[PDB]
Design a protein around this nucleic acid. Structure first.
Lengths: 83, 106, 434, 73, 169, 162, 82, 80
RNA sequence: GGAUUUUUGGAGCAGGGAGAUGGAAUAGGAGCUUGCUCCGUCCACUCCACGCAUCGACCUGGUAUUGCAGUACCUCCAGGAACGGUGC
């Protein structure tokens, strides 16, 4: 089936997320396009790679096997998942 | 009346310094131009005066804290259990005595 | 700052209430073993409250030794009396009462309604110090001890029977080394047993008992506690003998016994003391250890349903003749049919007869009272609460329409010839203008 | 089995970060629903400023950490 | 200007970072009332200034009247009501006083917002007979007193000042 | 009105405007400060505004304290052993209280992470060399009462009070 | 049994796969149990590298974080239901 | 026959699991499922070079668990 | 339904050298307590390649802004580094 955390990441698509991948990479930016395989093609992201220098680049693509975490918009606290 | 309670406590503290039934710290203060109708024996406040006096005596006796220290109470589970069972035993004796009185009244 | 009197009075009241509460708890009974353990800890706590009051009282003589001079005067008096009155002539107009002078320590050292708790005693119990396999004094905490015996021994020929036969003896032959980490493991296991004994006995004078036990270890075990007929005496921790008591005393002052070995009298004193505490707890709670052994045997050999359950702790209508009515009469009356009244707490009725009566039957009357909608005719046969609400709203609007509110319609012209409703009319009438 | 949304990233210059700290810039041409890629003119720069282009490489989605596209495609 | 939950404050230090700035604003506004949210940016559109959202218009007004020109990060900053509603609150003596010198052009909506600034009043009666007058009653006499002391000399359509007095018996 | 555990369980614990895990007491008037342990360390800020708190003491053992709001208080004096219970507590919103004496903040030096405080509208704020004793006896604090501590004022605070 | 649904809606401190933590009110779940932490706190270790300096655990604001199944290891229950 | 039902046939028996994060958790685990999904209940867990932490409701993962330790008086024939 | 994107795992490993520098109140073995000597776990300072470079806040001064907004982080110089972690 389809997982409700993944549905919340879909509800957070388009808008800005703040994800962290396997290498500590913190990408804070608009997560545009994503899949149920957690392969999210995003844009307008400040990707830091955990070194402190975040660079503001376009059209990044972060998978999910590396995904440590991903902050999704708080306004989704009224998303249909939790209620 | 908190002020009245404090005043009765002060009267008991002055009656713990009384030397005789007449010469103490309350005699002159009774008629010394201040209101004190609590020394009268019929007003229920004389019971609070007398109970404050009884506590003042049980605390101003030699073991009450005057010149010695009692430690079988301050470190004594043995004395605690003894005295507690003894209060329960006086309670049991009084229970049997009240039952006897009730049977006699019947 | 009268210390001679005020401290004595406070301590006396607190101690009277504490002794009274303890004596009441020990003159009544608790019905459960959990009640028993909680109340025993509480009785130790009441004795400790009395003890703290007494320890604060028996030291407050640094002011009394000098106040015996000041309070022993029969010459002064009414002067200081009038002065205390001059201070006590502040406003006491807080015209109310409060008994919080002499009635508090009853609710400080007394019992509770559903579980014996005073003011402080609301969280005192064996809840955080009781094992489930224990029961507040029925079983022990030794499963981890068996697991540690296994992780130490590395053998599958050690079960509950061998564990009990090895750990019951006080000074019986060790099956595991008191020269290896087996001594530390036994110290830890006897520590768990000593914790059981320290939580199970809060009415024993623990300080005096521990001091007597230390004096025992310092006097009677190191002074030939196991007599005999080399064979005169041997050491429990040293693993060395003596030709006699003289040889023992002359070799306890020898060189190799003091520091010339890892099993000497200085580096092994803690291990000897732990072995002693373990053997002493076992030989004292042999009836407790015996109850635990009988438990283990029955809980290991008994049946599974009872074992798990002990570890965890037609329909016809009834006729006028108390009999079930005929199936055909049932079918005719349509009772099999289930009608849900939600407003009634998702109640269910059998029979359309009962269902229709149900709107004037009590439980629906309440349900609608709770909703805030009168159980009137209009809502009969409505069951869903959202529907009842909505309908109540449109009915509110209806009756509001047909009602006559003078305040809103009755139109009043002012002396200036323009119209207000009578509300504003009287408003600005008495408001100085109209 | 799902294919990715890689048809837009097709024919784009992409700087991707692969595992081991690797940085490969290359052209996406067509991929497999497992994101199994083949990158044209793929130049994978070592930890240092030295880089090399290797043309045709079937790269891992197990080793690719992330990827970026420098054009709007 | 009207009572809103957001209390704006301008002319704070720009040598003070936004994080410690919102920390100190929360600290100084918790003593005023319920700090629900804080809208503070560090870009030149709203740099050096911040609006802290109170869970009460009474609380934000309290902070604005207590800390008017408040010593705050090197130079006293100026605190007042937000121009409009914040995003937080957006997602969230007598009984009656007579208003005089009121505009015969005034709007009932703004009049109701004004009379309800103090906890929601009963009603306002803009008299269609004798013009330039109102009679407004309150669901609370305390709010009535507050709003009437504020309204004696009230400024709405500043071409006049409308005054609220204890309406006679 | 005794301070109890109902006025703890009905309280709000959330992530407030300062991204701190705050427990709030709206309308408490609690003059007894104790028994906050079941706060469960999911909180870093403790606000108890509108309180009749007569003294600054009586707090339990938490490792992650971040803000303490004693705002709108009635404190007479301050207890000492706040430091072992607040290891790294940094912000203290302690205005509108009856602090007067230079010895009313003597336990303040035990705060290791102290960074900011507000004690305004108190008889202790108006005194001369008051911020001197402040920036001396709290050596760690770099800002207090909405103004940073400075090298010159710090040198003056060292020179005085000797 | 999908057991987690009985302890959900209340606050738990989960672990990461790298020794860190994520404390929050668990919102919703999936098959792979990748978590959805609301107003999450990320309490991680700070490398001491010394015995003369302490060991601290600083937590930043994550908000609503959708932690992957590569991070969900073990999650104790520590908070009341908000 | 995979170990699915060998792991899942367990409830609230004092066992000792080893999580692949260098940690151990012993206690009465609540319930196990088919894919090595087991929760913890009132469990005592020791981490890598750490303290005997207590968990009232901890949710142990499956492949992040390195091994299991059953009771000593349990017939593995009757368990698997 | 353990073979690249979530739970039958690519995890685990240890912290650069050296100097007639110090410490193990309570814990080391040997020379069969103490006195002295050796050796296999750190820290504190001092030497080298202050482990370096990068950057994100951060402490101090000076330095600009007066600016109505739903927020990765926002003026700039300089440092001394109290921190996070990256490439070797």
């Amino acid at each position: 089936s389809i997982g409700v955390p993944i549905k919340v990441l879909h509800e957070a698509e388009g808008h800005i997320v703040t994800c962290e991948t396997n290498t500590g990479e913190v990408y804070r930016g608009k997560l545009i396009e994503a899949e149920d395989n957690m392969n999210c093609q995003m844009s307008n992201i400040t990707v830091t790679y955990r070194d402190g220098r975040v660079a503001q680049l376009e059209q990044v693509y972060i998978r999910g096997s590396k995904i440590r975490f991903l902050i999704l918009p708080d306004m989704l606290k009224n998303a249909p998942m939790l209620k | 009346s908190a002020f009245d309670l404090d005043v009765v406590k002060l009267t008991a503290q002055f009656v713990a310094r009384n030397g005789r039934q007449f010469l103490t710290q309350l005699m002159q203060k009774e008629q010394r131009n201040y209101q004190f109708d609590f020394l009268r024996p019929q007003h229920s406040l004389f019971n609070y005066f007398t109970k404050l006096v009884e506590q003042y005596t049980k605390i101003l006796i030699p073991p009450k804290g005057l010149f010695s220290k009692l430690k079988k109470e301050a470190e004594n589970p043995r004395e605690v259990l003894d005295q507690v069972c003894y209060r329960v035993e006086w309670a049991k004796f009084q229970e049997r005595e009240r039952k006897k009185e009730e049977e006699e009244k019947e | 700052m009268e210390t001679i009197l005020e401290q004595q009075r406070r301590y006396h009241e607190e101690k009277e209430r504490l002794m009274d509460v303890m004596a009441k708890e020990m003159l009544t009974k608790k019905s459960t073993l959990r009640d028993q353990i909680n109340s025993d800890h509480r009785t130790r706590a009441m004795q400790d409250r009395y003890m703290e009051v007494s320890g604060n009282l028996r030291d407050l003589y640094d002011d009394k030794d000098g106040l015996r001079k000041e309070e022993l005067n029969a010459i002064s008096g009414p002067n200081e009396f009038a002065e205390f009155y001059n201070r006590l002539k502040q406003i006491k107009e807080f015209h109310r009462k409060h008994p919080n002078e002499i009635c508090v320590p009853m609710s400080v050292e007394f019992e509770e309604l559903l579980k014996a708790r005073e003011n402080p005693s609301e969280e005192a119990q064996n809840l955080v110090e009781f094992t489930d396999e224990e029961g507040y004094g029925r079983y022990l905490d030794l499963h981890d001890c068996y697991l540690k015996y296994i992780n130490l021994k590395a053998s599958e020929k050690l079960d509950y029977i061998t564990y009990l036969s090895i750990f019951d003896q006080l000074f019986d032959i060790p099956k595991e080394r008191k020269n290896a980490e087996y001594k530390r493991y036994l110290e830890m296991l006897l520590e768990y047993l000593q914790d059981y004994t320290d939580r199970v006995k809060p009415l024993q004078d623990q300080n005096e008992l521990f001091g007597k036990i230390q004096a025992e270890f310092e006097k009677k075990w190191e002074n030939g506690t196991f007599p005999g007929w080399e064979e005169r005496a041997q050491r429990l921790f040293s693993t060395k003998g003596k030709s006699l008591e003289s040889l023992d005393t002359s070799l306890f002052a020898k060189n190799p016994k003091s520091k010339g070995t890892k099993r000497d009298t200085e580096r092994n004193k803690d291990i000897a003391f732990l072995e002693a505490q373990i053997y002493e707890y076992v030989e004292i709670l042999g009836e407790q250890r015996h109850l635990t052994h009988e438990n283990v045997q029955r809980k290991q050999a008994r049946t599974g349903e009872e074992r798990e359950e002990e570890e965890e702790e037609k329909n016809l209508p009834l006729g006028w003749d108390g009999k079930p009515i005929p199936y055909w009469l049932y079918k005719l009356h349509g009772l099999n049919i289930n009608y849900n009244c939600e407003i009634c707490g998702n109640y269910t009725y059998r029979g359309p007869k009962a269902f229709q009566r149900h709107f004037a039957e009590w439980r629906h009357a309440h349900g609608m009272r709770c909703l805030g909608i009168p159980n009137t005719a209009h809502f009969a046969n409505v069951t869903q609460i959202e529907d009842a609400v909505s309908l109540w709203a449109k009915l509110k609007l209806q009756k509001a329409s047909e009602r006559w509110q003078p305040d809103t319609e009755e139109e009043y012209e002012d002396s200036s010839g323009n119209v207000v409703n009578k509300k504003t009319y009287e408003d600005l009438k008495r408001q100085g203008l109209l | 089995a799902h294919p990715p949304e890689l048809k837009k990233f097709m024919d784009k210059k992409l700087s991707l970060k692969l595992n081991g700290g690797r940085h490969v810039q290359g052209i996406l041409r067509g991929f497999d629903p497992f994101m199994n890629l083949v990158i044209d003119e793929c130049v994978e720069m070592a930890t240092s400023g030295q880089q090399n282009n290797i043309g045709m490489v079937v790269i891992r989605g197990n080793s690719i950490i992330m990827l970026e596209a420098l054009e709007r495609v | 200007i009207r009572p809103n939950h957001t209390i704006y404050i301008n002319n704070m230090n720009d040598k003070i970072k936004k994080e410690e700035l919102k920390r100190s604003l929360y600290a100084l506004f918790s003593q005023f009332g319920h700090v629900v949210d804080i809208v503070a940016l560090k870009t030149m559109k709203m740099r050096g200034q911040a609006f802290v959202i109170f869970k009460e218009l009474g609380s934000s007004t309290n902070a604005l009247r207590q800390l008017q020109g408040f010593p705050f990060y090197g130079k006293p900053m100026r605190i007042q009501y937000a121009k409009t509603d914040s995003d937080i609150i957006s997602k969230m003596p007598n009984y009656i006083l007579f208003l005089n010198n009121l505009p015969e052009e005034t709007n009932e909506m703004m009049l109701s917002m004004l009379f309800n600034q103090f906890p929601g009043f009963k009603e306002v009666r803009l008299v269609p007979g004798r013009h330039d007058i109102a009679f407004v009653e309150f669901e609370n006499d305390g709010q009535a007193g507050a709003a009437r002391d504020a309204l004696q000399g009230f400024k709405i359509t500043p071409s006049h000042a409308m005054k609220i007095t204890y309406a006679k018996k | 009105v005794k301070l109890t555990a109902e006025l703890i369980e009905q309280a709000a614990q959330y992530t407030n405007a300062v991204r701190d895990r705050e427990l709030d007491l709206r309308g408490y008037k609690i003059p007894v400060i104790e028994n906050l342990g079941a706060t469960l360390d999911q909180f870093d800020a403790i606000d108890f505004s509108d309180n009749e708190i007569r003294k600054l003491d009586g707090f339990p053992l938490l490792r992650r304290l971040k803000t303490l709001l004693v705002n709108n208080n009635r404190i007479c004096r301050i207890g000492e052993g706040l430091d072992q219970a607040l290891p790294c507590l940094t912000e203290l919103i302690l205005t509108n209280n009856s602090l007067v004496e230079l010895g009313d903040l003597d336990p303040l030096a035990s705060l290791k992470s102290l960074t900011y405080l507000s004690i305004l509208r108190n008889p202790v704020t108006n005194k001369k060399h008051y911020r001197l004793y402040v920036i001396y006896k709290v050596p760690q604090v770099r800002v207090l009462d909405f103004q940073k501590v400075k090298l010159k004022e710090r040198q003056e605070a060292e020179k005085m009070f000797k | 049994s999908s057991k987690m649904l009985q302890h959900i809606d209340y606050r738990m401190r989960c672990i990461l796969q790298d020794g860190r933590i994520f404390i929050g009110t668990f919102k919703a779940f999936d098959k792979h149990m990748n978590l959805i932490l609301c107003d999450c706190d990320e309490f991680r270790k700070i490398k001491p590298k010394n015995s003369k300096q302490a060991e601290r655990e600083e937590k930043r604001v994550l908000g609503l974080v959708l932690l992957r199944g590569e991070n969900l290891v073990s999650m104790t229950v520590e908070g009341p239901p908000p | 026959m995979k170990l699915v039902r060998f792991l899942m046939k367990l409830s609230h028996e004092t066992v000792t699991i080893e999580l692949k994060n260098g940690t151990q958790v012993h206690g009465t685990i609540t319930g196990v499922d088919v894919s090595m999904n087991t929760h913890l209940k009132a469990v005592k867990m020791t981490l890598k070079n750490r303290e005997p932490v207590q968990l009232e409701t901890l949710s142990i993962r499956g492949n992040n668990i390195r091994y299991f330790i059953l009771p000593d008086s349990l017939p593995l024939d009757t368990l698997l």
